[PDB]
Design a binder for this molecule. Structure first.
Ligand SMILES: *[C@@H]1O[C@H](CO[C@@H]2O[C@@H](C)[C@@H](O)[C@@H](O)[C@@H]2O)[C@@H](O[C@@H]2O[C@H](CO)[C@@H](O[C@@H]3O[C@H](CO)[C@@H](O)[C@H](O)[C@@H]3O)[C@H](O)[C@H]2NC(C)=O)[C@H](O)[C@H]1NC(C)=O
Ligand SMILES: *[C@@H]1O[C@H](CO)[C@@H](O[C@@H]2O[C@H](CO)[C@@H](O[C@@H]3O[C@H](CO)[C@@H](O)[C@H](O)[C@@H]3O)[C@H](O)[C@H]2NC(C)=O)[C@H](O)[C@H]1NC(C)=O
Ligand SMILES: *[C@@H]1O[C@H](CO[C@@H]2O[C@@H](C)[C@@H](O)[C@@H](O)[C@@H]2O)[C@@H](O[C@@H]2O[C@H](CO)[C@@H](O)[C@H](O)[C@H]2NC(C)=O)[C@H](O)[C@H]1NC(C)=O
Ligand SMILES: *[C@@H]1O[C@H](CO)[C@@H](O[C@@H]2O[C@H](CO)[C@@H](O)[C@H](O)[C@H]2NC(C)=O)[C@H](O)[C@H]1NC(C)=O
Ligand SMILES: *[C@@H]1O[C@H](CO)[C@@H](O[C@@H]2O[C@H](CO)[C@@H](O)[C@H](O)[C@H]2NC(C)=O)[C@H](O)[C@H]1NC(C)=O
Ligand SMILES: *[C@@H]1O[C@H](CO)[C@@H](O[C@@H]2O[C@H](CO)[C@@H](O)[C@H](O)[C@H]2NC(C)=O)[C@H](O)[C@H]1NC(C)=O
Ligand SMILES: *[C@@H]1O[C@H](CO)[C@@H](O[C@@H]2O[C@H](CO)[C@@H](O)[C@H](O)[C@H]2NC(C)=O)[C@H](O)[C@H]1NC(C)=O
Ligand SMILES: *[C@@H]1O[C@H](CO)[C@@H](O)[C@H](O)[C@H]1NC(C)=O
Ligand SMILES: *[C@@H]1O[C@H](CO)[C@@H](O)[C@H](O)[C@H]1NC(C)=O
Lengths: 644, 5
């Protein structure tokens, strides 16, 4: 004891980078205050049995730890410190040790197999170190072990099959390591096991079919491994299971119908695997299921209509599969379903009438299916909608009567469908909407002026419709729009000068329209604009000087127009320009003396113009093909179609 | 120390 206090003082004297504030300053007067005043020290019969120095800013190693001088230690917590070096084998000499914690340190090297001498150990904690090598098989001798936590280390090798001998183990935490080989089937003998977390390892092989004997496991986490084979049906015998995560593995075969026998399963994560076959009908009998994610697999066939029995279903992720047939009404019948992911599948038919029947659905994705028909009325009135994605389908109907008011809408994608009718001003009620994408529809009429009052809009895409009318100057009110795509419509009149005010604009496409008259002279106030496509319009007259004040331009296409006059010299201010397309115009006059001053241009086209004179000295001009440069009145100093 | 994943 006095010898115990001296031994710990000698060890303390080896600590480096210590201050006077250290709580170990109380290690004084070894002869008379060891069991009463020393921080972290506690004794029985005047002999230390408990050393709890967690989070005491100790920097040092265990090389000179007084193993022999503290024979009666039973609780060692040295965690949350700056200990380095290895775990000496002499730690196995503490025959009375019950609790052993060296976690959250900078320990390196392997776990000494001498820990298997610690026959009284009930808790082993070595997490968040850099321990490498294999887990010693002799740890399987510690049959009083209740919990092993070795996670967040650099451990390799297989899980020892002796671990099946730990008949009292309740928690096994080995995640965030590099454990390999097959999971030993002897783990199925751990009848007291409650939590088995082997995730984020490099485990291979099959999930052992003996896991069906783990009747007390509530948490099985094995995700982010390299497991192969099939999910054994015996997994359905783990009746206590609450969370089952096998995602990001290389599992194959079908989902076993026995999973429907897991009456306590709330979370099931099987995503990012190679599962095939149909979803068994019995999956609907998981009455507790809250969060079902089997997305990113190769599942085929229809979704079972029994899914209407999952009355606690909140999240359903079936995206990126080969699911087919019509969507059954039960898939969306839960009153608490808030997320329904079905995109990237082969669903056909029309949306069921149950979609938002409880007014609580928030995210709905249907992208890249073969769905058709009208929007169900419960979806029209789904005021809780936040994200809705319909891209790449054949949905039909009047876009004005198909979608109600969506006060919580944030993102909606109607692209690549057959929606008809006119854009209603109801969208302005979506005061939180940041993106509205409706490309490739049969949308007609004008853009309602209320759209320009959606200052929160970041991205507006109405391209490839049959929208008509002239754009008002109130377009300037879209303060925060960065991607504006109105191309491929029948919009007419002059381009509004108010686009000047869209300071956040980065990508602007007004091409393939009926915009007439001169490009606005004032359009010089877009410092973030790197793309502007005005091609295939009825614009005419000189290219304005205002365009040349958009320094951040990288692509600029004014082709297929009726612009005339000379190309300005002032383009030199567009030093960040790379692609410049000016073909199919009536541009005339000589080439500017500059365009040597630019070094970023890589692509150009000036064909089918009345330009004359010599080509300048830049790569795109040297690298131009015949199509790039033909059609002009007097091309080059030496009448050349190609180099020099 | 000793937390579920
Ligand atoms: C398990 O890890 C230990 C410790 O390795 C050290 O810590 C790791 C977290 C990484 O940062 C390693 O890069 C780091 O070295 C390994 O033991 C260590 O082995 C290396 C060689 O592999 C030793 O480095 C040598 O040092 C001597 C001088 O002492 C030189 O002559 C050599 O040229 C070489 O640089 C290092 O000293 C040693 N550390 C010890 C023993 O504490 C161990 O090999 C590794 N086991 C595995 C990966 O199975
Ligand atoms: C060394 O001293 C520290 C500081 O007192 C101890 O940390 C404390 O440890 C206990 C467990 O022994 C923690 O209580 C636990 O709380 C959770 C959640 O409420 C509960 O589910 C557990 O059953 C347990 O009761 C306590 O939170 C924790 N306190 C802090 C601040 O971390 C440490 O355990 C001591 N170690 C030894 C070996 O004596
Ligand atoms: C292509 O342009 C020529 C040149 O007209 C230019 O137009 C001015 C705005 C200015 O840029 C000047 O450099 C030119 O005058 C057109 O040829 C003109 O045609 C009009 C009749 O429409 C005639 O009165 C002018 O005298 C012509 N000028 C010349 C130099 O011939 C030509 O018609 C245009 N072609 C197309 C398809 O638009
Ligand atoms: C602390 O450890 C010492 C041994 O280092 C224990 O002393 C032994 O106690 C047993 C049981 O009374 C005796 O049979 C031995 O002869 C003792 N050996 C020595 C060298 O004294 C002591 O009992 C331990 N104390 C506690 C509280 O565990
Ligand atoms: C298990 O599946 C993963 C998928 O995450 C595979 O990792 C990919 O392998 C191929 C290369 O062969 C590529 O798709 C990527 O480079 C890998 N990483 C990804 C997609 O994130 C892994 O190879 C599979 N293991 C097998 C088949 O044994
Ligand atoms: C479900 O809700 C939103 C609907 O847009 C999804 O998108 C994110 O929403 C937050 C706002 O809470 C934004 O900050 C993110 O930028 C959005 N992400 C994207 C990619 O747009 C949200 O991710 C969804 N949550 C899920 C499916 O769990
Ligand atoms: C600007 O947008 C138009 C479309 O309005 C793009 O035109 C396409 O050009 C490619 C070759 O350059 C053709 O194969 C396509 O058929 C064209 N599409 C249409 C609808 O005509 C044009 O390329 C864009 N300008 C750019 C990208 O600089
Ligand atoms: C002490 O801390 C300093 C600064 O973090 C570090 O450079 C040094 O290596 C540490 N150890 C010793 C013995 O000084
Ligand atoms: C588990 O304990 C039994 C008891 O004798 C022993 O025979 C067996 O070898 C142990 N398992 C391993 C993997 O060592």
């Amino acid at each position: 004891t006095v010898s115990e206090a001296n031994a710990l003082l000698k060890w303390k004297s080896t600590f480096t980078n210590q201050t006077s504030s250290s709580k170990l300053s109380s290690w004084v007067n070894p002869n008379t205050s060891f069991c009463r005043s020393w921080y972290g020290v506690s004794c029985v019969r005047n002999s230390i049995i408990r050393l709890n120095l967690t989070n005491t800013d100790i920097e040092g190693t265990f090389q000179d730890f007084p193993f022999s001088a503290l024979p009666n230690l039973s609780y060692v917590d040295l965690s949350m410190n700056r200990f380095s070096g290895t775990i000496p084998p002499q730690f196995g000499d503490f025959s009375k040790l019950i609790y052993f914690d060296l976690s959250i340190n900078q320990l390196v090297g392997e776990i000494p197999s001498e820990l298997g001498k610690l026959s009284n150990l009930e808790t082993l904690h070595l997490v968040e170190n850099k321990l490498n090598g294999s887990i010693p098989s002799e740890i399987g001798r510690l049959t009083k072990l209740h919990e092993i936590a070795l996670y967040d280390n650099l451990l390799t090798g297989p899980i020892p099959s002796s671990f099946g001998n730990l008949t009292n183990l309740a928690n096994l935490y080995l995640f965030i390591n590099s454990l390999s080989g097959p999971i030993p089937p002897e783990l199925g003998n751990l009848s007291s096991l409650a939590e088995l977390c082997l995730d984020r390892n490099k485990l291979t092989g099959q999930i052992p079919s003996s896991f069906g004997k783990l009747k007390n496991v509530t948490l099985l986490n094995m995700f982010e491994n390299n497991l192969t084979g099939e999910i054994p049906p015996e997994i359905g015998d783990m009746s206590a299971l609450d969370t089952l995560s096998l995602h990001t593995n290389n599992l194959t075969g079908s989902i076993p119908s026995s999973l429907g026998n897991l009456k306590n399963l709330a979370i099931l994560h099987l995503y990012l695997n190679k599962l095939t076959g149909s979803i068994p009908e019995e999956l609907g009998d998981m009455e507790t299921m809250i969060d079902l994610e089997i997305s990113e697999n190769k599942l085929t066939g229809p979704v079972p209509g029994s899914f209407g029995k999952l009355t606690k279903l909140e999240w359903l992720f079936l995206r990126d599969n080969h699911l087919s047939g019509p969507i059954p009404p039960g898939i969306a019948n839960s009153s608490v379903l808030t997320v329904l992911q079905l995109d990237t599948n082969n669903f056909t038919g029309v949306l069921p009438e149950t979609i938002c029947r409880s007014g609580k659905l928030e995210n709905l994705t249907l992208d890249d299916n073969l769905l058709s028909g009208p929007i169900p009325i419960s979806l029209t009135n789904c005021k809780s909608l936040i994200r809705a994605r319909f891209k790449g389908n054949s949905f039909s109907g009047d876009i004005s009567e198909s979608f109600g008011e969506y006060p919580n809408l944030n993102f909606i994608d109607l692209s690549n469908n057959k929606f008809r009718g006119q854009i209603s001003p109801k969208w302005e009620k979506s005061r939180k909407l940041v993106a509205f994408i409706a490309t490739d529809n049969n949308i007609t009429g004008p853009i309602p002026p209320e759209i320009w009052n959606m200052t929160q809009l970041n991205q507006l895409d109405l391209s490839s419709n049959n929208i008509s009318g002239e754009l008002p100057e109130t377009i300037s009110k879209l303060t925060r729009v960065s991607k504006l795509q109105l191309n491929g419509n029948q919009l007419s009149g002059r381009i509004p000068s108010g686009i000047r005010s869209l300071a956040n604009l980065e990508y602007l496409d007004l091409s393939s329209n009926r915009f007439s008259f001169q490009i606005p002279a004032t359009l010089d106030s877009l410092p973030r604009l790197y793309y502007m496509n005005l091609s295939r319009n009825d614009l005419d007259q000189n290219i304005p000087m205002g365009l040349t004040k958009l320094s951040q331009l990288q692509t600029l296409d004014l082709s297929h127009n009726n612009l005339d006059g000379e190309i300005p010299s002032q383009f030199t201010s567009l030093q960040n320009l790379e692609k410049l397309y000016l073909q199919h115009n009536n541009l005339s006059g000589p080439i500017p003396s500059s365009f040597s001053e630019m070094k970023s241009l890589t692509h150009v086209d000036v064909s089918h113009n009345n330009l004359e004179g010599p080509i300048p000295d830049n790569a795109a001009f040297k690298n131009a093909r015949p199509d790039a440069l033909e059609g002009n009145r007097d091309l080059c100093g030496s009448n050349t179609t190609q180099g020099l | 120390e000793s937390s579920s994943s």
